[PDB]
Amino acid sequence: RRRLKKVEEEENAATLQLGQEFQLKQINHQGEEEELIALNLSEARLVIKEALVERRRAFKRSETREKELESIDVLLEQTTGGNNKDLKNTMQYLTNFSRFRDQETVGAVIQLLKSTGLHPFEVAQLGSLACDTADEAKTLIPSLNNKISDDELERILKELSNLETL
Amino acid sequence: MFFIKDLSLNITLHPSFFGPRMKQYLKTKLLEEVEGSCTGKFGYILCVLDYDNIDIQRGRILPTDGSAEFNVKYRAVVFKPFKGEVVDGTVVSCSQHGFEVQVGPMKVFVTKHLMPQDLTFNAGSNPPSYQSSEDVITIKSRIRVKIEGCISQVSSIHAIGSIKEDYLGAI
Amino acid sequence: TXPGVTXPGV
Amino acid sequence: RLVKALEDIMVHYDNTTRNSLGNVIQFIYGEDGMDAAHIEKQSLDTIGGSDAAFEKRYRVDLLNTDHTLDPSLLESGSEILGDLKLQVLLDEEYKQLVKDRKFLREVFVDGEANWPLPVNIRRIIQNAQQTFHIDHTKPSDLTIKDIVLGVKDLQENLLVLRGKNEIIQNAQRDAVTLFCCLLRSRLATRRVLQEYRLTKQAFDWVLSNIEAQFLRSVVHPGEMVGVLAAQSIGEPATQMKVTSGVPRLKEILNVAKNMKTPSLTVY
Amino acid sequence: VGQQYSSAPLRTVKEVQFGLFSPEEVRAISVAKIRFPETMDETQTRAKIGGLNDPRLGSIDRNLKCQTCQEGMNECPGHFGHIDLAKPVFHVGFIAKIKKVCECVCMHCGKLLLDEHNELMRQALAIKDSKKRFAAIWTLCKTKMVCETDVPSEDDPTQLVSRGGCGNTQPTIRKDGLKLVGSWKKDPELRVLSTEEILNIFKHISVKDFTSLGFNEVFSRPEWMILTCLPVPPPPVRPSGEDDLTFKLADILKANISLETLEHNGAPHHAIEEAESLLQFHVATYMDNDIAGQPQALQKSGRPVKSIRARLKGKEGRIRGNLMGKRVDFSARTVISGDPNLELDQVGVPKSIAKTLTYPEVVTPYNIDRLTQLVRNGPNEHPGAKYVIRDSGDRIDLRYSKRAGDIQLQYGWKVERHIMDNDPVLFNRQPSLHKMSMMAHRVKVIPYSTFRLNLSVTSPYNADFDGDEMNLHVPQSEETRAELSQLCAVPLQIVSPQSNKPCMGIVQDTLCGIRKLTLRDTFIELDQVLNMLYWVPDWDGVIPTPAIIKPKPLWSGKQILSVAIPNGIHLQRFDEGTTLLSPKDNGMLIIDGQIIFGVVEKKTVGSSNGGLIHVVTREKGPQVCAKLFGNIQKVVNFWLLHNGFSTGIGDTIA
Amino acid sequence: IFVYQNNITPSAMKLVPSIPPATIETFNEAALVVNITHHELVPKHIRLSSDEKRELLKRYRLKESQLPRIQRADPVALYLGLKRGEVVKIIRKSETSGRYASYRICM
Amino acid sequence: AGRAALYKEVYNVIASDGSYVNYRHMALLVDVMTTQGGLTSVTRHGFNRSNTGALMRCSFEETVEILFEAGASAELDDCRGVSENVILGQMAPIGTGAFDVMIDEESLVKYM
Amino acid sequence: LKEKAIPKDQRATTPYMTKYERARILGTRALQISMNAPVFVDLEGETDPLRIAMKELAEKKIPLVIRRYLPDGSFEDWSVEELIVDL
Amino acid sequence: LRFGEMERDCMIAHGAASFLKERLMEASDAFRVHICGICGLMTVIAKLNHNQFECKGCDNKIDIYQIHIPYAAKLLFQELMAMNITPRLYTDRSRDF
DNA sequence: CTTTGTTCAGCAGGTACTCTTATTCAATATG
RNA sequence: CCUAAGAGUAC
DNA sequence: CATATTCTGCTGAACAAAG
Ligand SMILES: [Mg+2]
Ligand SMILES: [Zn+2]
Ligand SMILES: [Zn+2]
Ligand SMILES: [Zn+2]
């Protein structure tokens, strides 16, 4: 409720203290509750590209890194206007650190991490970080300690590194 | 990291704007106002998803004013950094106090106190960089940084990162 | 009473 | 004091009369849901008169000669006699009129006939008579079945509460029961065919105007009936054995335990 | 210019949450610590820093901005200061409540006396509303004068269960002025309960205990009823000769400094107690100067000091004298006079009043021409405009702006112009006991110094013309104008919900004239018939065939009056002894808008149910009823003017 | 129902509330001489079942407290044995309409 | 029956001098006075004593005491009453304010 | 708000526009017309915004909906097009 | 002229809410004041030209609203605050009807 | 485990509007 | 400019 | 020689008393 000025804990991914508005379940615009899904770098990049191309088609009706950058710059200039410095920086950051190419690989990764039955934030971080070994991932993400077996995490990171392209 | 969240914004429309293109005006004014914006509550707001049909609802006339107050609900993509989170980035600048790394739409400043003693500043090389015994970190160099602090700023945020932990630094 | 014309009482 | 007490009373969109807290004061405004300004004094013909007079006024028999009707009253004056279904309609209509007579005699112990009711049926009947030029000699084009079914449908169309559940329907019937009693008192088969001599178009026009006026007389949600009542009570007090007038009103509103003239009535 | 644009979102207050200031909240919101009782420094030209008029609390001079918000006196709401009290004092408005709370909580261990183990405590705590809960808890726990560290078991009164009680003896607590005295049972020992120990016992009350007493965890804890920090209101609250609140705050600071010096330098407990009592009295009289028994804290001028409670309560207080009812602009008041030649819904407005009262008309392509013409006319002639409100908020006064040249109006601007004909205006006679005593009329500008209203509309107002004054309010927006014309219009108020009968009728000279006109003796020649027919504005233009054709064409009064009655009206009232034929010409029969028979008098055209007014307004609408009022008044007044009526001493002689 | 002659000793009043669901109702013979419900001022009172109360609150969108209140000491409430929370339907011969049905909740 | 007797008393007072007031006004008055299970007097100790909002209650009588009790009890005022909105200077939810007027984009486009 | 909104197919309020509803529609529409709002009716020379709003309402060309609030907070959306103006 | 209590009562009886509001706010005293959603108090330092809103104590700068209340209402609330009472003004419903 | 039998308890007074007239602590005391 | 008092007008 | 302070209306709630 009001609680006047209520004290709160400092956010910490190690403790997974995301926030009161970043809880696991969120009420959608339809009135029901959905699990808070978190997008990895490639998944978020694909979502942004789909949104921008859909906006471009709506306005119209009413791979290598360099050509990708040229195409995204042209599409960004064509679709939206100015004051997109943050958007441009985010887009170039995503294209530079693009862990995946297209829909098939990101879908396979997301369904595998769903089958892992883990926290959405942790699986998104796993899909974002290109770790190599198991203990390395554990020390990179403190929230993974005492949650999954060492062999399973190591093998799933092995398949993720296998799915790495270019 | 990147998330998708359900946001809502109140828009006040003047009586002169109730033409057949009212939906277009509302959709355009939602943009240029929240696209790529920054706030402490949700971090950065980058783009709006599902633009084909944004929920605008009915819209209430403010009494004695005539302006209509719409509560437009939409899906937005956000980038809120979090404490103790490892993320990739690109070095853009170095200085005496530390170096700035480009992570998405934000610049994270890692101070000289948050590096191992083997890594030291070097202004002799042009541009000035940070050189260590085994590796060197220069401009436009990929580096992984762990964010451990977030500072709210005006129309932007400057987080605090580190590479002191194991397997942190240039790849 | 009232007041006026508390209560009664109070 | 009265205005401050009643300042937050309002008629809401479900016709209940609620204060600021949402507490129900009346489940329907004025126990009939009617705007006060749309109420006129009208006479209930069923409650008054004698049983013989009541039968002569309302009872119509298609099979006997004591309470038969003149065949020249209506077009089918010679074919209705000997009918069974139309006699059933008359039987049930007169039974309903008798029930209304008993109910109204129960409601008003003194048998008072003139009471305030929303829609003035008499003026509607006179307007129809003057507009359609009732010659009072040509047999009426109306059929008795038409009269009965039209009255039934008109009662079905007098809606105060629009809900679609048994509670709201029961409340609607209870809200419109008295005006339905008046309507049946006025728009009877004998009275329509003989006293007024409506035609088919005139009868339909009468039904339409009654429905329109009743739907117009319903109280409008958002009416500030509390301040209206407080003012309508306080203002007459300004114009003003047992205490009366301003001191008695003072005593009543204060609910004083001690009163100047505590009197009791024994029957 | 009003208030400039603010980027903060605009919302409407949905809920008001009352409570108490925590001392830390006062210290957090305060922008200064007031220490010096002097309002002005030694220079006597500036506000002393740290004084009661600290510029951080708001600017006392128009020439200077507020030191905190850097805004003018127009914008600056004023920001509170804080006085850190040397010793805690009782809040005058809560002492009784405090006397109850300390009577419900053990004065040593700080716990509620009767826990749920008591039989009646389940009933008491089950109450929902906080006030009733606290009333029950007080009326049951006042009689208990021991903490009861060991109570019989709830399951059975055989074994004893020990709760968190200390077993001490609670004192009987009374109040002697502004202090509480406790008497302990003799093993009575009387001593004054210091405010510090009461605050200490309040702060030790458990959350569950004081939330069962009605207090809230967040908004109002019981220990916040004790004043340790005084929130100093800004100079907007006490504008300047200083205000009474300023002198009271100076006295409070003086007492605080005296107590602080006495405590620091060391003093006998007599002097310390005297200073503490003086501070308590000053604070209490600052918040409430109408304390029973205690003498009023007089001002320097020997008069009682106006406290905050005095400022709020009463007819002239804030709530009743400035919020429920306040003085409003765009209102006029003057003597009224009768005008039989005005319509029922019209009110006569003096030309000067119309030139003063103004309405803002939004400039639109549909009314640019006439608004421009009014702007050209200026405010010194009627009709005209008095102001031009620009879209930027700047206001052009039509006076002194003629030198710069003609003003070019733009769409969206406002022309604040004189009220013209057909402008809906609320019109009132006070006391205004009912809604019919406050009705929307249409302006008719007239060249005389009195309001002019129809004779028939005086009855709802209860207005005569023997010196009565009436009020005129002008709506300043199209929404208010429209709802005023569609809800409060005079024709719509003809039938009163007060008695479901018309409230306006034909009265005074028109009623006598209409009785004299409709007599069977009254026959009207051709010329007077033509004049009377022309006086009916909606007369269809056909001369009715005379009631008598030979040997001389004569129209009866009923025939001419029936022209005023609208077509399609049937009325049939039967008086005492009347038949279908009318030997006495009483009763009333009107068929198809023609008076068949009956003398028209109070029972027909007066404000009675079933009369002509009621029938017409229920058959043809309120507008036609007002038209009937006008037509009847015009024709009857013409006939009475050309016929004459009087009264004298001979009328009282038998 | 316990029907007494003059009065009950208060030492017996305290033990009147027995083990639930058993309830003891005390009535005075002098107070029971005249049946108040036959008075023309007293309208028709009908206790509502739990389903009927639920339906009433559902159809009118009411809460428990928003209903008109009837004390659990009112002579009619004692007459019909109303317990707290139960709603009585009140049938009244109104004069603007023939029948008016109100509802009062026991407190 | 107490409410019926109260209405009869009020009607007798009104009609003692021959004046007539419609049934529904006095019915509303006597229903308000008897809606709490007991006869509520039209006074500060009567209607003014009800959890109907601190701002409304104080505007009648004993203003400062009502404010003090509301502050001590941490009352929440929902601003559903006329007096609350009058004090706060906003459109009361009465008459024209008993509803919200809104705009239909689809209908407006449907016009042209 | 999805729970609050009573579905259109089972609204239970009067289909007739109330005097207060009509007054507020006329006031709001006249206020908008005064501020150069688009007109959806042809004008026959009228210049008063109030009578422009009256002409708009007479032939049902006002694109507003009444959100009638029930005492419990639930509301019904009645379009001015489907409201019957009998008064 | 005094638009007293019972004139307001007559306007309430007429059902004209907007005219009553215009009488009590625009005609007499319309005051725009800033509050915050954390504490309903009017202790919001609002530098409009610099476009900075800050409520000290709550330590917030992004949760500020503006309301239009009569200056008499603002003075009443400030006197209540001076009298150790918090008239916290909240612009959203925390309880259902 | 119930019985009477004295003594103290707390205010409000209708709605507007017009005008006039007096008055802002006295003076002894110290800088 | 404030406060108080008085006189008066319409109910 | 100039500023500073010394009429008109009641029922309970509470207190002493006790077999
Ligand atoms: Mg007079
Ligand atoms: Zn300021
Ligand atoms: Zn204790
Ligand atoms: Zn705050």
| E433 and E521 inside one domain | no
DSSP string, E351-398: HHHHHHSEEEEEP-TTTHHHHHHHHHH-SSSSS-EEEEE-TTS-EEES
The pair of structure tokens assigned to A157 is 């990171």
Q: What CA–CA distance (Å, rounded) separates F53 from F76?
A: 19
Distance, CA of E396 to C1' of K3, in Å = 39
Q: What CA–CA distance (Å, rounded) separates E488 from E468?
A: 22
Residue E136's CB is within 10 A of a number of other CB atoms, namely 17
Query: Among I65, I86, I93, which would you mutate to test the E interface (most chain E Cβ atoms within 10 Å of its Cβ)?
Result: I86
| Homologous superfamily of B85-171 | Nucleic acid-binding proteins (2.40.50.140)
CB of G91 less than 8 A from some CB of H: no
Q: Which residue has the tokens 């020992």?
A: E189
User: Which chains have at least 3 CB atom pairs separated by less than 8 Å from chain B?
Assistant: A, E, G, H, I
Q: What CA–CA distance (Å, rounded) separates A67 from A76?
A: 14
Q: Which residue has the tokens 């203002």?
A: D235
A111-149 burial code (b ≥16 CB/10 A, e <16): ebbeebebbbbbbbbbbbbbbeebeebbbbbbbbeeebe
Q: What CA–CA distance (Å, rounded) separates B158 from B44?
A: 12
The amino acid at D60: V
The resolution in angstroms reads 3.0
The pair of structure tokens assigned to E191 is 């001593």
Domain residue limits at H10: 1-87
**Which contiguous run of DSSP H or E holds residue E460?**
helix E458-461
B101-121 burial code (b ≥16 CB/10 A, e <16): bbbbbbbbbbeeebbeeebeb
Whole-angstrom CA distances from E158 to E151, E153, F30, G59, G95 are 10, 7, 41, 55, 65
CA B94 from centroid of its chain's CA atoms = 21
Q: What CA–CA distance (Å, rounded) separates B2 from B21?
A: 33
Strand partners, D11: D17
Å from CA of E253 to ligand 2 middle: 23
The pair of structure tokens assigned to E359 is 């309405």
Residue A144, SS3 per DSSP: helix
Domain residue limits at I48: 1-85
Residue ranges of alpha helices (H) inside chain B are 22-30
Whole-angstrom CA distances from D95 to D60, D92, E230, F16, F98 are 11, 5, 80, 53, 18
DSSP string, E187-250: --EEEEE-HHHHHHHHHTS-HHHHHTTT--SSS--GGGGEEEEEEEPPTTTS-----HHHHHHH
Q: Which residue from D31, D167, D175 is facing F56, i.e. has the nearest CB?
A: D167
Q: Are D36 and E497 within 8 A, CB to CB?
A: yes
CB of G25 less than 8 A from some CB of I: no
Whole-angstrom CA distances from E18 to G59, G69, I11 are 16, 9, 29
In a domain, E607, yes or no: yes
Query: Are the CB atoms for E495 and D118 separated by under 8 Å?
Result: no
User: Which chains have at least 3 CB atom pairs separated by less than 8 Å from chain E?
Assistant: A, B, D, G, H, I
Interface of E with H in 388-417 (CB under 8 A): 411-412
Distance, CA of E428 to C1' of L8, in Å = 36
Query: Are the CB atoms for H33 and H39 separated by under 8 Å?
Result: yes
CA E149 from centroid of its chain's CA atoms = 55
Whole-angstrom CA distances from D73 to D145, D199, F102 are 15, 11, 46
The pair of structure tokens assigned to E454 is 């129809």
Q: What CA–CA distance (Å, rounded) separates H21 from H27?
A: 10
The amino acid at B157: I
Q: Verify if strand K has an atom below 7 Å from the CB of E302.
A: no
Strand F100-106, strand F69-70: pairing: parallel
CB of B71 less than 8 A from some CB of A: no
Nearest to E440 by CA among E355, E344, E552: E344
The pair of structure tokens assigned to E142 is 């006042």
Q: What CA–CA distance (Å, rounded) separates E490 from E343?
A: 10
Q: What CA–CA distance (Å, rounded) separates E66 from I48?
A: 13
CB of D245 less than 8 A from some CB of G: yes
Closest nucleotide to the alpha carbon of C3, via C1': J12
Which chain D residues touch H15 with a CB distance below 8 Å? 162
Q: Which residue from I15, I96, I97 is facing H20, i.e. has the nearest CB?
A: I15
I10 appears as a binding residue in the annotation:
no
CATH 3.30.1490.120, chain B: domain bounds: 1-84
Q: What CA–CA distance (Å, rounded) separates D93 from F73?
A: 46
CA E623 from centroid of its chain's CA atoms = 32
Pick the CATH number of B1-84 from 3.30.1490.120, 3.40.50.720, 3.20.20.150, 2.40.30.10: 3.30.1490.120
DSSP string, D117-132: ESS-HHHHHHHHHHHH
Nearest to E636 by CA among E544, E541, E563, E570: E563
What domain count does chain I have? 1
Residue H2's CB is within 10 A of a number of other CB atoms, namely 8
Query: Are the CB atoms for A134 and B7 separated by under 8 Å?
Result: no
Whole-angstrom CA distances from A104 to A109, A110, H62 are 9, 10, 51
User: What are the contacts of D71-78 at 24+ separation with CB within 8 A?
Assistant: D71/D139, D72/D139, D73/D139, D73/D140, D73/D193, D73/D194, D73/D197, D74/D139, D74/D140, D74/D141, D74/D142, D74/D143, D74/D144, D74/D193, D75/D139, D75/D140, D75/D141, D75/D142, D75/D143, D76/D143, D77/D139
CATH architecture of F35-107: Alpha-Beta Complex (3.90)
CATH 2.40.50.140, chain B: domain bounds: 85-171
Specify the CATH number for the domain of residue I43.
Answer: 3.90.1800.10
Domain residue limits at E575: 494-646
Q: What CA–CA distance (Å, rounded) separates D32 from D40?
A: 14
E466 appears as a binding residue in the annotation:
yes
Q: Strand K proximity: list residues 391-430 of E with CB under 7 Å.
A: 430
Query: Are the CB atoms for A93 and A125 separated by under 8 Å?
Result: no
Q: Verify if strand L has an atom below 7 Å from the CB of D136.
A: no
Q: What CA–CA distance (Å, rounded) separates E523 from E554?
A: 6
Residue ranges of alpha helices (H) inside chain D are 2-5, 51-58, 85-107, 121-132, 144-156, 166-186, 189-190, 200-217, 225-239, 245-254
Whole-angstrom CA distances from E641 to D143, E456, E638 are 57, 18, 5
The amino acid at I36: C
Distance, CA of F11 to C1' of J1, in Å = 9
Which chain G residues touch I95 with a CB distance below 8 Å? 76, 78
| Contact residues for A158 (Cβ-Cβ < 8 A; gap 6+) | none
Query: Are the CB atoms for H47 and I42 separated by under 8 Å?
Result: no
Counting one residue from chain C and one from chain G, the pairs whose CB atoms sit within 8 A come to: 4
In a domain, E304, yes or no: no
Q: What CA–CA distance (Å, rounded) separates A102 from A42?
A: 8
Write down the experimental method used for this entry.
Answer: cryo-EM
Domain boundary among E440, E475, E493: E493
Q: What CA–CA distance (Å, rounded) separates D181 from D201?
A: 24
Covered bases, chain L (protein CB within 7 Å) = 8-13
Å from CA of E149 to ligand 3 middle: 7
Q: What CA–CA distance (Å, rounded) separates D219 from D15?
A: 8
Closest nucleotide to the alpha carbon of E172, via C1': L14
Domain boundary among E227, E255, E287: E287
Q: What CA–CA distance (Å, rounded) separates E571 from F41?
A: 39
- What phi and psi, each to the nearest 5 degrees, are found at residue B48? -110, 130
Residue G68's CB is within 10 A of a number of other CB atoms, namely 29
Q: What CA–CA distance (Å, rounded) separates B129 from E370?
A: 75
What domain count does chain E have? 5
Instruction: Give percent helix, percent strand, percent coil of chain F, each to the nearest 5.
Output: 25, 25, 50
| Contact residues for D206 (Cβ-Cβ < 8 A; gap 6+) | D124, D125, D128, D187, D198
Q: What CA–CA distance (Å, rounded) separates A85 from H48?
A: 50
Q: What is the 3-state secondary structure (H, E, C) of E565-633?
A: CCCCCCEEECCCCCCCCCCCCCCEEEECCEEEECCCCHHHHCCCCCCHHHHHHHHCCHHHHHHHHHHHH
Pick the CATH number of A39-62+64-166 from 3.40.1410.10, 1.20.1250.40, 2.130.10.10, 2.70.70.10: 1.20.1250.40
User: What are the contacts of F74-78 at 24+ separation with CB within 8 A?
Assistant: F74/G37, F75/F31, F75/F36, F76/F36, F76/F37, F76/F42, F76/F45, F77/F106, F78/F25, F78/F27
Interface of G with F in 8-37 (CB under 8 A): 23-24, 31, 35-37
The amino acid at F38: H
- Cis peptide bond prior to B116, omega within 30° of 0: no
E269 appears as a binding residue in the annotation:
no
| E536 and E641 inside one domain | yes
Query: Are the CB atoms for D3 and G86 separated by under 8 Å?
Result: no
**Which contiguous run of DSSP H or E holds residue B12?**
strand B2-13
Q: What CA–CA distance (Å, rounded) separates E534 from E635?
A: 9
Distance, CA of G58 to C1' of J14, in Å = 19
Q: Which residue from E9, E412, E477 is facing B64, i.e. has the nearest CB?
A: E477
I55 appears as a binding residue in the annotation:
yes
Nearest to D60 by CA among D50, D48, D73, D49: D73
Q: What CA–CA distance (Å, rounded) separates E605 from E588?
A: 11
Residues whose C-beta lies under 7 Å from strand J: C 2-10; E 241, 292, 300-302, 315, 325, 327, 333, 430-431, 469; F 9-11; G 61; I 1-2, 4-6
Q: What CA–CA distance (Å, rounded) separates A43 from A38?
A: 9
Chains G and E lie in contact, requiring 3 or more CB pairs less than 8 Å apart: yes
Q: What CA–CA distance (Å, rounded) separates E375 from E397?
A: 10
Give chain B's length: 171
Q: What CA–CA distance (Å, rounded) separates D194 from F19?
A: 71
- After what residue numbers is chain C broken, C–N > 2.5 angstroms? 5
Q: What CA–CA distance (Å, rounded) separates G34 from G26?
A: 12
Q: What CA–CA distance (Å, rounded) separates A72 from A77?
A: 8
Which chain H residues touch A31 with a CB distance below 8 Å? 2-3
Q: What is the 3-state secondary structure (H, E, C) of E53-93?
A: CCHHHCCCCCCCCCCCCCCCCCCCCCCCEEEEEEEEEECCC
The pair of structure tokens assigned to E503 is 């409230």
Query: Are the CB atoms for E439 and E490 separated by under 8 Å?
Result: yes
E521 appears as a binding residue in the annotation:
no
| E233 and E335 inside one domain | no
Q: What CA–CA distance (Å, rounded) separates E255 from E268?
A: 17
Å from CA of E109 to ligand 3 middle: 4
What is the four-CA torsion angle of I89, I90, I96, I97, rounded to 10 degrees?
Answer: 40
DSSP string, D85-111: HHHHHHHHHHHHHHHHHHHHHHH-TT-
User: Which chains have at least 3 CB atom pairs separated by less than 8 Å from chain I?
Assistant: A, B, D, E, G, H
| E377 and E395 inside one domain | yes
Ligand nearest to the CA of E465: 1
Ligand nearest to the CA of E64: 2
Nearest to E226 by CA among E74, E323, E91, E105: E91
The pair of structure tokens assigned to I57 is 């104590």
Q: What CA–CA distance (Å, rounded) separates A143 from E15?
A: 42
Covered bases, chain K (protein CB within 7 Å) = 1, 3, 9-11
Q: What CA–CA distance (Å, rounded) separates E318 from E322?
A: 5
The pair of structure tokens assigned to E286 is 């600052």
